[PDB]
Amino acid sequence: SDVYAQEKQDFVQHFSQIVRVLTEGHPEIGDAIARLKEVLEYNAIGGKYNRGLTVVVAFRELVEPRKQDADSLQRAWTVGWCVELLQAFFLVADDIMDSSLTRRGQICWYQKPGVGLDAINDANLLEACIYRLLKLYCREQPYYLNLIELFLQSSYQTEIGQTLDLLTAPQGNVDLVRFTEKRYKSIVKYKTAFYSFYLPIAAAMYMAGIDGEKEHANAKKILLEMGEFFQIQDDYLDLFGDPSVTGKIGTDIQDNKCSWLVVQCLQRATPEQYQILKENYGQKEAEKVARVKALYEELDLPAVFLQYEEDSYSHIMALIEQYAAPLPPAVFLGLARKIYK
Amino acid sequence: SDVYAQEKQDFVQHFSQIVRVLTEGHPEIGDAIARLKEVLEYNAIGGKYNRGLTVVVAFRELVEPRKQDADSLQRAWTVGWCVELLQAFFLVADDIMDSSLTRRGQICWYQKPGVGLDAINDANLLEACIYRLLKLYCREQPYYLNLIELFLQSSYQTEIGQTLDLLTAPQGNVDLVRFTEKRYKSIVKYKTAFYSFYLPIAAAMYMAGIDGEKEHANAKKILLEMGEFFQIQDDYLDLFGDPSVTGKIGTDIQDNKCSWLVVQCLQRATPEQYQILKENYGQKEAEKVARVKALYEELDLPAVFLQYEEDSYSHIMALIEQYAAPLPPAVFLGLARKIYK
Numbered sequence: 001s002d003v004y005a006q007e008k009q010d011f012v013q014h015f016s017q018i019v020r021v022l023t024e025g026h027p028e029i030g031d032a033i034a035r036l037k038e039v040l041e042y043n044a045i046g047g048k049y050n051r052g053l054t055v056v057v058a059f060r061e062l063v064e065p066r067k068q069d070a071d072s073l074q075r076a077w078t079v080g081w082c083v084e085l086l087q088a089f090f091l092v093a094d095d096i097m098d099s100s101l102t103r104r105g106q107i108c109w110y111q112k113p114g115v116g117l118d119a120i121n122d123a124n125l126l127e128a129c130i131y132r133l134l135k136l137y138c139r140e141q142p143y144y145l146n147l148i149e150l151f152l153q154s155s156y157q158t159e160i161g162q163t164l165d166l167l168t169a170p171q172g173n174v175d176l177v178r179f180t181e182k183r184y185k186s187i188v189k190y191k192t193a194f195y196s197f198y199l200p201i202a203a204a205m206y207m208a209g210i211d212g213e214k215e216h217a218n219a220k221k222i223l224l225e226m227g228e229f230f231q232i233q234d235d236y237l238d239l240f241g242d243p244s245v246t247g248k249i250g251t252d253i254q255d256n257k258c259s260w261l262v263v264q265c266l267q268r269a270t271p272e273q274y275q276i277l278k279e280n281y282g283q284k285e286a287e288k289v290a291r292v293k294a295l296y297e298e299l300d301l302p303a304v305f306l307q308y309e310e311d312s313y314s315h316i317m318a319l320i321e322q323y324a325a326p327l328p329p330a331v332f333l334g335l336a337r338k339i340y341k
Numbered sequence: 342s343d344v345y346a347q348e349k350q351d352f353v354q355h356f357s358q359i360v361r362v363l364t365e366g367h368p369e370i371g372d373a374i375a376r377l378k379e380v381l382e383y384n385a386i387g388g389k390y391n392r393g394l395t396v397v398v399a400f401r402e403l404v405e406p407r408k409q410d411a412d413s414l415q416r417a418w419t420v421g422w423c424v425e426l427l428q429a430f431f432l433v434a435d436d437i438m439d440s441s442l443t444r445r446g447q448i449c450w451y452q453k454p455g456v457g458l459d460a461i462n463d464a465n466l467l468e469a470c471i472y473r474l475l476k477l478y479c480r481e482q483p484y485y486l487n488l489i490e491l492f493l494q495s496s497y498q499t500e501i502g503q504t505l506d507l508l509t510a511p512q513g514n515v516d517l518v519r520f521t522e523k524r525y526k527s528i529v530k531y532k533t534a535f536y537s538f539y540l541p542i543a544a545a546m547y548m549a550g551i552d553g554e555k556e557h558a559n560a561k562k563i564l565l566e567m568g569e570f571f572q573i574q575d576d577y578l579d580l581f582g583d584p585s586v587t588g589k590i591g592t593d594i595q596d597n598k599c600s601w602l603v604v605q606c607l608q609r610a611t612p613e614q615y616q617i618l619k620e621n622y623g624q625k626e627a628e629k630v631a632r633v634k635a636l637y638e639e640l641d642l643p644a645v646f647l648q649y650e651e652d653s654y655s656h657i658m659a660l661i662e663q664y665a666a667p668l669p670p671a672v673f674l675g676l677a678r679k680i681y682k
């Protein structure tokens with residue numbers, strides 16, 4: 001808690017250097033490069049950097065300390081920042097698609113005067129910056145191609161999950177029949193879990209010389225399952241999370257989201273309850289949102305969640321027991337600690 | 342003309358197989374994959390396939406015929422289609438950013454009922470498909486990493502050029518002071534020339550085992566210069582091209598575009614003419630567009646263009662003379678033939 005959040009400070013320090021090298025004898029693109037700088041400064045800074053940091057922490061846990069020279073650690077910081085750029089790319093584009101107003105407390109980049117739909121290009125640049133950074137810092141390393149493929153695959157999985165989410169939850173289309181458990185698991189796995197949990201550990205593994213298919217598959221089984229719980233808790237806190245403790249106030253119900261809650265509610269609802277949901281879900285009427293929350297409450301979804309979090313915790317510890325070796329279980333336990341608070 | 346347009350038929354034939362392999366034991370993403378199929382069918386088909394085809398023609402010219410087996414030609418078709426996907430990605434996103442209505446004769450993908458801003462994700466998928474295809478067909482080839490880097494770099498150059506264009510030509514901002522020759526050359530080089538002319542020949546070169554830095558630099562010098570002329574002629578035809586001969590009718594003036602014409606007009610205009618341009622450029626008033634065309638005409642810009650096309654043709658032939666070897670000059674002359682019509 002005090003040692004993990006020290007490591008956070010150095011992470012954010014490295015950002016200036018990330019930006020410097022991404023923004024260098026080509027005079028008349030200078031103006032585009034200055035715009036690239038604003039995009040990076042506004043969109044890559046101001047999160048909690050959990051994904052990026054995971055690359056750094058894991059790399060330190062997986063390498064023998066007498067192969068951790070200044071250049072080694074530099075590359076770990078940089079590939080951490082690559083994960084944060086991938087995420088910035090997804091967020092900027094996602095906020096346009098959903099018509100969001102704010103992000104990380106502030107006006108979404110695309111809503112800023114003079115940006116608008118130009119944010120589409122800006123997001124594309126954020127994505128491109130990943131591969132410039134990999135080239136600049138890792139091109140001579142034996143894991144180079146492995147990291148390129150990892151990021152590309154992570155992008156594809158995320159885009160695919162996003163497609164599935166958009167089909168499943170059209171804004172302005174009350175359709176609870178799309179909102180099944182199988183479909184919810186599928187969205188979370190592709191859209192969130194691969195890039196948030198598998199990507200950063202996998203990156204660290206490759207940087208450490210652990211490139212085995214089986215080892216990667218073992219780590220993935222643990223990490224996708226943590227990803228699933230992360231999102232489910234995220235859906236629960238959207239509506240039941242003390243809002244001064246989380247940051248946010250939730251709009252999942254308004255937004256016709258395929259949330260963990262609605263899925264559970266629909267497995268439990270009578271025909272009558274189905275209709276209260278059907279009349280009220282995915283509307284912005286405060287009163288219509290009241291009566292969904294109330295339905296969820298009457299059905300003891302908070303209790304169902306707590307039961308789920310307990311079960312999920314034993315399942316995760318079992319998976320770690322079974323699939324962590326020959327990585328140190330600490331690699332996985334550090335992540336479990338941050339999400340099963 | 343009859344032999345080049347035969348080779349076009351086989352190109353488009355291969356498309357079905359492209360789509361088949363991109364759309365395969367993961368049941369519950371099936372719906373996303375069906376959406377991927379529509380995106381590909383609507384946006385990758387219906388151009389003239391000049392960029393993709395250039396990969397195939399060049400590959401055939403650069404390889405010894407007794408290393409051109411069925412698998413070899415398969416990979417050339419596929420990397421051709423990769424160039425067409427990159428272009429589909431850029432077009433779909435560009436039409437959103439510019440608020441275009443039609444493309445290749447039909448309603449732009451994003452303007453279609455139920456798509457809208459979801460087209461941002463769809464465009465991202467088109468981009469992703471490139472690297473799936475490279476992996477599926479080229480992962481065992483020694484040029485694999487070279488092609489990945491080439492496409493990534495081509496994407497970055499294009500995005501950068503797009504940034505510069507957006508800064509230079511804000512819709513709803515009469516600013517002729519941004520519209521210099523240096524800035525115009527710079528936009529065309531990054532936004533158009535690298536991916537339209539350098540990318541497909543470079544791809545063919547790598548597939549042929551020609552990976553030399555110097556050879557690539559030599560080919561680039563010819564190909565960027567052809568790219569520049571292509572765009573300049575494109576700007577001329579927007580306004581002076583018989584519209585039944587081109588396909589289109591032009592909206593460069595309306596659109597506050599940094600066209601070759603406005604740049605030239607501004608090097609030639611008196612203070613008085615500057616004001617007619619300043620009052621009339623980048624407005625949708627038919628009469629205001631009349632009076633720009635008329636200014637261009639009074640300044641003999643059609644004559645200036647024809648002089649430019651002649652000069653450009655000698656310059657291109659000189660560059661080919663000087664920089665083509667040891668590639669067959671036919672590689673470059675085939676391209677010159679298609680654009681200096």
Ligand SMILES: Cc1ccc(-c2cc3c(N[C@@H](Cc4cccc(F)c4)P(=O)(O)O)ncnc3s2)cc1Cl
Binds near residue numbers: 197230245
């Ligand atoms: C690998 C990894 C990737 C992402 C995270 C994240 C944690 C987190 C986050 N953590 C909160 C707790 C939390 C919020 C939502 C779901 C959850 F499981 C835990 P906090 O400890 O910042 O108050 N809040 C918002 N977004 C994220 S993303 C954590 C990890 Cl270990």
Ligand SMILES: Cc1ccc(-c2cc3c(N[C@@H](Cc4cccc(F)c4)P(=O)(O)O)ncnc3s2)cc1Cl
Binds near residue numbers: 574587676
């Ligand atoms: C490598 C390469 C890449 C792109 C092309 C293109 C030709 C072309 C194109 N060609 C017309 C001619 C033309 C149009 C605009 C500029 C120009 F130089 C030539 P056509 O022969 O289809 O009537 N029209 C619209 N877009 C494109 S893109 C041609 C080549 Cl050789």
Ligand SMILES: [Cl-]
Binds near residue numbers: 071072
């Ligand atoms: Cl080193």
Ligand SMILES: [Cl-]
């Ligand atoms: Cl997977």
Ligand SMILES: [Cl-]
Binds near residue numbers: 412413
């Ligand atoms: Cl073979």
Ligand SMILES: [Cl-]
């Ligand atoms: Cl270059």
